[PDB]
């Protein structure tokens, strides 16, 4: 009574392929009829089964968790669940993505599967749910996830690749087929596609952290997907998988795999540690992947691979009573050759499975076999089986959408359009007096300029259905690529500017250098991740408060450079908005129509309420006012009433006044009051996680929290703010500034953080303060809370530098140890040391027994690196740790140079 | 344009009315109100409006928007269609169980659920039997798939539809709860046949004759195959019972749907006009029409929280029947359909006055209008005068959809020929006649020589090697394999007797031509085919029946082999009857049809051929010795019967030392020896031992029941006597006949023979059964045995022995003579009348009229109270049943008849006077007074005592029995004098008679 999704879907695809093959006969006697209707019935059934569960989709749309994951296995007799989610996991996205890709495939073919508008809304909700696949770990195609099989989830490249392919294919397509006007389209966000592509390109070399190579990579990089457009990296991946996974009887799933082998017993779902070491060398064999390699070869026009793989497949294939071809599932070795096989790999002969003689079949296997034989017999053409041109040759890759630019693959010379708009007439005339031309918005009456929240509320409006219960698109910020387009709402043109220009309660937005660097970064990002037809539109706004006297020079220089035409190697164009908007494609949104301080903490802590209120009244210092407000809120509460309204309103007013006055300590203290956070921490933490680094939040010398997997923003905010309440006052904004700066630097200068594994903001800022104190020398060390954003950025870039001689070597050792620097190749040196260390290594009271780490671990896997970092991190003195690692490197060199 | 505005308005109305509760995913609309249920009939009927609207869009679309609108409407239709199909295909076990035997327990549920398509109720909480819903569903499915929508995807659905065809094909002899889910007229529902279900099913079976479900791109196996005899049986049943909906209901309004827009199945348009005029003159009201007389639904009485009506509907449900505008909105469509326009305007103006405007100002059809609870007495004296008030649910999707479809039809946007691409509007076009082809062949060379001797040229079974002939039981066994699936546990069509309509047409099986002989020349089933005269009469009636309808294309073809049994005793010449019949069927006129002769070579080029595709490949030893040595058929049959009963049901007799001769084998062999002698004295005896059953007994039985007649098996008295008031399955009927006949064995055979004879008599001459209300086979046996005894002047045993020895033609003639009706002279006819209780035509009405003016009529203690006159009506059967039960207490037939003339003379005499007797009347006392007066008059004349004799147990003179009815000395005058004297005896000293 158990049914999978992948096998039935593959069988339906094979039946559709056979129907398309037989369609070429006008006297078919209706044989195409039953195959097409079988495909339609299968797809209607799977769609009905998906739509049966509705609460889980809504729950997953908000809080993605294994509890709220959509079920993947259910009874085939009545379409109901039979097994609890505590024994399966049920979390799997590759099936949904593959189903979407195939359904759009047959819709483009000419088949009819959808009937009413409700299914369109369901498809929209499914797309919204699968947009967030790049963060949540999956159980994997093989259901086992990690090779240890203990009950943990890890990221898989194949799932994200399939998601990217489906997201690209579903964009801008009419779902009803031949007929459709305004209720058959699909809307796609480019930011999700860009993030998925980035995650692929980062994680593509290694399928997972715990898996160097698996055989499941082929379908993601073969006919079912066609997702890897890198040729050379494709060639190296194919060569690696072929070399490491080739077998006499086919392809194994991956190395050290005891799946249904002779030693495996049906009594323990989770494998005990060190059993994987015993499980090697007896891995089961799957010949189905010969068929996939046959498919890849025939689409690549290489008959030599076709003939070699056909010759290899001929003897292993089995026959029925009538001689029908049979492809068994897996191959196993008898118990007699358990040890003899280990000495000589492949010397002995394996035995066929139960589903290789009679009474049992592997329908997925015969489906792939029949489709491969159909393609090999040349009964159809590759274009017929792929009407949506998923795979294209190198000479046709010139003017495709969402993949390549019109300039060619190995070219980047995009020109970006930028529009100049003023804000006030006085500022406009002042700029005109200096030659800078700008337009105040009141002469742009036909066109309307709106902020970014109009678009998010509009996107929240769509995708709402009353019968089922639907919240539509979640309220999320829109990236610069989305806002670079032009919109039409109710027949009125709408243009928006990037979120960097809007007023921000934070303080670093008042620095001209930070804004210049940010706008340059945005321009680069637009240049390098733009592929849509038509030049992008960029809107820039200048406020009269930005000039603020002597600060008016750098903005003049930037505007002059913008007028010149080139900004750091990026070509730019400037003209009036009316000419740019005219003659350009505008995208339509028609869904809406259808639908020093003198006050100290200790001295004034015990003062009465009225005295503190009077002191607040008669004092003008900002720091004293802020500290009195803090004492009042800590003692009385935020709901207290003061002379200037409520406590919260007074805090907001004084914080805004400090931000206008640019008192960095005052604005940071007010920000700590406001209980606010940036809306970009999650991208930084997830990109740090996918890079391979680790992030720890805490204070130097105090408790620290380690993060190893992506987490919801609520939990991270809670833990960081409880820590903040425990130890200090103005730190929260400090770690915010450091983390945003570090993320930006790693985004634009990734090689600067080379050698980093565990990044610790507290140790970084302590090293920063120590270096600043050294630079001060005789003069007292300047307080870090009063440093401008430009100064902290410059000091961070200076301390993050590779460093040179001249300074005291002790300071270099301290800063290296604080950053937890490690030499390149240290981990492999430690591993080769332990392999040649019969007893072990004991440092600072920690023991590293050789037997468990040799029987559990291998060369390049990350778990050893984590363990060695854990045992190394017990050293209190960072320079002592650096001395220890240098000693380890010297020992490794001297021992490897002489084996005697 | 104006048409665009009107179509937009109609689409908006449909969207706001019916589509708002479409319930996607499942596709099942709720069955109105807050009931949370889905009735199949309402879901089927609620799609016609959307369907017609989409077809109106499709022809005039010519634009992307209208193309998309038509597409979405068609996709919604197919969604709803598949939603209906899924619930039934989920329940194949029940249809498989129903395919064998008939019962309510193994029937499909009538109320399916919402999402997940589950069950809501069990099998003992609702009436789960509605053939009309399934039939009308399949009719619209055929119409839609003929239109050009793909509804069927998988081939297993074809097998399921084929199984459902057999599920509904037995509607002409299966009783159902009814369209109203209320059983018969009163509650405590008993299954009873109605004309609506049969009429609905006839067109449904007709529609799927060859209509493939795969469209123009089908294959060799894409067409549903249906027979033809069931359609003719349904048509005959409908024609017999068209004026009245059922035997308990005088008229139902639901007959309009059968004889209007959905499923035109009716002929002889005079009956159409008659039933329309009758329904108009009897069921028309003020703001609507009623379903049928005496229904209490939604009444200020009845205690609505209670079911199972108590038998006290005297006047609590008279002339207060609420209303039903559904049959009103039927009339507008019926009128606008064919050629009528002024009636359409009249009905539109009538119905526009009774509409209710709700939200947004849109038409809304109320369900019914209820009489106010206070103004009830006035309506009893002035019917259809008191105003009514709306009450009950009114989201009536059925009526609104039909009304909007009718309005769209009348607007002229859509043509009548588009709704029905099958062209069902021409069922009233007469068909002139058909020509029947008959082929003759000889079994052996001797027969061919004999036929050529008299000038008849034929051919044997040889010389025509390309064609083959075999009996029709092989054909039925072949038919028993259609629509068979092993994965779905489907056993295909069950075995049934094959009609003459199917054997007439030619057949193709694996590039071969086959011909099947008629079933009545089968001598291995029954012996009634051993008579040449009967063979002639079955040929005549079968040719007449074949030439009557013949609704299938091409000319017929009948094969009539000549057997060895139809030669003379010498075996050197055919019988005179056979030669005469051959000469009559030559020259092109035999019976009542034109018959053309020839050879199969000429007939093959002009004859219908049916291509078949589903058969393509994918001390007892002392007794045995005594039996062996003894001779004579009597001892043979006796010893075999004793051995079979005692130890030989299947035991081997070991009479042959080399072949194991079982008892059944010996009895089967004895038939061959009996056949030559033509001894009709033991063939029945052995047939009773082998328990041979006649085919099509249930069809003849239901034909007898359909004529408002009550059947009865078993000789008197009670409780051995039974009453078959409803159709029964073949096994139940056979078991009932067995238990009624007891161990006499031959009684069952003679009862079956009489039943067959009466069935054949009913169709030809349905006029000899008047004045007769309860048929009694046992009484017929007693009467016929007594008649033969009187004719032969022998004892009862000799009369019976001569009775069994008579040929079937002798029984035919004698039964016809008895039915026709053609001292010791008057007593015989009097006894025959008493035995057959041939009451006059207007007896019950006059009895009721007299009972209206008296407290009752006592008959020897038993009393007929006058309170029954208000509990019943003269047209009802129960009053007649009680009257007969009162009259049949006395055993003597002469007593029954004399009571009859006495009560009649009281009836005639009651008209003259205008008074109320106010007393109970004893008929026996009047008869005794009349007899005493006759005795006194005869004594006064001077007749000697010998003629004024006294019967041993009567007290009535035999000369009074012998007296003729009329005349100046008849019994009628004495009865009138006695009745008048008795009336005077209980009268207040004043007659005051005038006329």
PDB file of C-alpha atoms in Angstrom, chain A residues 11 209 218 221 246 264 307 343 349 374-375 378 514 525 527 537 547 551 555 628 651 657 712 737 753 783:
ATOM      1  CA  UNK A  11       6.575   6.198 -15.705  1.00  0.00           C
ATOM      2  CA  UNK A 209      29.730  18.756   3.496  1.00  0.00           C
ATOM      3  CA  UNK A 218      23.970  12.951 -12.460  1.00  0.00           C
ATOM      4  CA  UNK A 221      23.535  17.555 -14.309  1.00  0.00           C
ATOM      5  CA  UNK A 246      32.715   3.322 -11.878  1.00  0.00           C
ATOM      6  CA  UNK A 264      23.014  -5.052   6.945  1.00  0.00           C
ATOM      7  CA  UNK A 307      27.976   1.761 -28.267  1.00  0.00           C
ATOM      8  CA  UNK A 343      41.573  -7.932  -0.940  1.00  0.00           C
ATOM      9  CA  UNK A 349      30.983 -12.475  -8.977  1.00  0.00           C
ATOM     10  CA  UNK A 374      13.438   4.707 -28.060  1.00  0.00           C
ATOM     11  CA  UNK A 375      15.968   7.540 -28.328  1.00  0.00           C
ATOM     12  CA  UNK A 378      16.220   7.296 -33.645  1.00  0.00           C
ATOM     13  CA  UNK A 514      29.412  54.852   3.186  1.00  0.00           C
ATOM     14  CA  UNK A 525      25.664  44.132  -8.518  1.00  0.00           C
ATOM     15  CA  UNK A 527      25.937  45.234 -13.845  1.00  0.00           C
ATOM     16  CA  UNK A 537      16.491  51.784 -14.790  1.00  0.00           C
ATOM     17  CA  UNK A 547      24.946  68.812   2.026  1.00  0.00           C
ATOM     18  CA  UNK A 551      30.239  67.933   3.546  1.00  0.00           C
ATOM     19  CA  UNK A 555      28.744  64.709  -3.446  1.00  0.00           C
ATOM     20  CA  UNK A 628      18.106  59.401  32.578  1.00  0.00           C
ATOM     21  CA  UNK A 651      13.108  58.035  23.383  1.00  0.00           C
ATOM     22  CA  UNK A 657      17.625  64.404  17.380  1.00  0.00           C
ATOM     23  CA  UNK A 712      14.731  31.749  11.992  1.00  0.00           C
ATOM     24  CA  UNK A 737      27.980  47.159  12.234  1.00  0.00           C
ATOM     25  CA  UNK A 753      39.105  36.140   4.863  1.00  0.00           C
ATOM     26  CA  UNK A 783      36.698  55.393  22.713  1.00  0.00           C
TER      27      UNK A 783
END
